[PDB]
Amino acid sequence: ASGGIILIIAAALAMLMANMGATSGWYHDFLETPVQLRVGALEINKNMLLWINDALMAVFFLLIGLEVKRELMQGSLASLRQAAFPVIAAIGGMIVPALLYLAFNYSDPVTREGWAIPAATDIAFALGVLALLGSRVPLALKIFLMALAIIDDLGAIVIIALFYTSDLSIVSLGVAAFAIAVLALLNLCGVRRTGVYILVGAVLWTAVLKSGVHATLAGVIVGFFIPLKEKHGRSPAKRLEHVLHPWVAYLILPLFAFANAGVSLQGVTIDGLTSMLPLGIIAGLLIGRPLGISLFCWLALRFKLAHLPQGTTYQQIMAVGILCGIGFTMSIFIASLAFGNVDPELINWAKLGILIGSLLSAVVGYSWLRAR
Template sequence: MLQSVRRFIASESAGGVALALAALVALVVSNSAWAPYYERFVQMPGELRIGGWLVLTKPLLRWVNELWMAVFFFVVGLEIKRELLAGELASPRQALLPAGAALGGMVVPALIYAAINLSDPVALRGWAIPAATDIAFALGVLMLLGSRVPVSLKVFLTAVAIIDDLGAIVVIALFYTAELSLPMLGAALLGCALLFALNRARVMSVGPYVIVGLVVWVCVLKSGVHATLAGVATALAIPLTRSDGGSPLEDAEHALHPWVAFAVLPVFAFVNAGVSLEGVSLATLADPVPLGIAAGLVFGKAIGVFGASWLLMRWAGAELPSEASRLQFFGVCLLCGVGFTMSLFIGALAFEGQGAGYETRLKIGVLGGSLTSAMLGTLVLLRAGRRSR
């Protein structure tokens, strides 16, 4: 189990570097003479046609956010199931600290954002944006610090981010869906029933699940619920173990991790992180939307994760991760404010159709808040490392 966790951490941290480079390239290109070409690229139309009964026409940005990211959510679903059944969240005692920390890290940032944007009903739709943690970026920072950070803190951060992703999935399902088409939703539910029938029949090949999952994806897309949730539903049906001791779930997870880390997430970052900084000033940064996002990520995450953890350690018998000091633990709590991927994703859903103004403010807030949290967390962990030596 420990070897599996180490492989997962190594893959995610390397992916964090690729993700950061893709976001940086997008930011540079969108503020250069190549900006018109970048905009044309992300808005390039694409069409999927099967006979005359299925026609899907969307720009590249939507294909990435709705189909490409379904692969990411499929892997997230695999991780959640593995951790719940056989990993760090398998027992209530193990799950207590990261679960409480993740809950605090979602509630407090959302409250801070809502308090700052209470007077604007459109801006208020983005209340969940700072509630997310980007596991690839955050673990990438931890891995760059090497042995200065105990392995137990890396495992804690991984567990918090996985629970955080589960919370984000629930938020998307409940609050960021369009008008529902009941027939298509019914068809999607039938597809999910077929997925779990395959599981009960002990079908060990991942192929049939993927085929049914693609049908579910189309039905969910047409139903009005965000299509990426089909990836999670498909993942939860994959069997954990087979009779020879192997694991179809872990095989699929290990096969897809490099693709997600080095293709899916960097492409998502490239098409979503491009924002023109022309005309951006201190007044722009003080606008309620970017201010609420940045404050939620930097202050809300640190206060929520550390505060909930302290309460659990004080009153519920939870314990500080082994070989970690309180200052190191606080540094990791700061890193939970790196919310790049999921924050941009939720923001795109929250402000869909609201114009480029909200999109620009969203990206400025997410980029500024995530970068600040990464720098503060790194500084605290470096200081904690020197103090421990």
């Protein structure tokens, strides 16, 4: 549970940075510093926070690409029957939070673009709460919770990068196609040097640098092409996952939380928090997330399509759904993509609803499994 506490400290300092008179100002002007890269006729204009998030989430989703790959062949998602229960819980833990969010924001076309905000879950935070009181928590829950949030987080990035995304340059997709083609020929030829995949992945990440969501998917694509074979007792993807895990939990995610979880609390009132944008996220995370997860897990159990992990009780499942309401870093990153290049207060109001929703989802989920 070490990675969970060090993530809150980074968010707590970010709040102190954005609310103290001496720190706020330099904290806001730094994150909005223009960074213009000019290469001949080419020109990439992104602010400081954009360059930071495009690089941090690329490494974070590279670890996910390795984790998804070994879960899809060796873990819970390996077979179509074992993967039924986590996937069914994911579709429910998305359509119900979205409908609740859209129930509040259907009248405003600007805000209903972020319907995928209360559909994410901070994996490092949710695992941290479990590991906090996890002396004898059923190991199948951590496999279920990790697999449940992995599909909702990756699915949200794929959906955003397919429809609500802006089409990139034709030259960008051509290099991206060639970069994936090289990664494909590399895996088919049987090369196992992890750095060569990262070298080609850097070309893939650079070609789609203008789109933050495509540069994020570059990490997922590279993580899928890292070989997992166990030749001579060595695996590149298992070894790369072992190296990235401490760097992501102790540097990547803390830096992302310190640079995004900092909003000013001056002027925030109860009536302001009950408006459609923040309350829609609060209701989507605190209520919509456990409801859809509990409903779809239960519907699967009754209609014969379900599988059950070891020591299920199916009362711990809904408490996990409450713990899935901890969007935090993932929901903030989803909100940064949905509420980009629009009114600068949309992203601030979203972060207020995410943190209140995540803190309440953490305490309520803490109060149940503690009793169990």
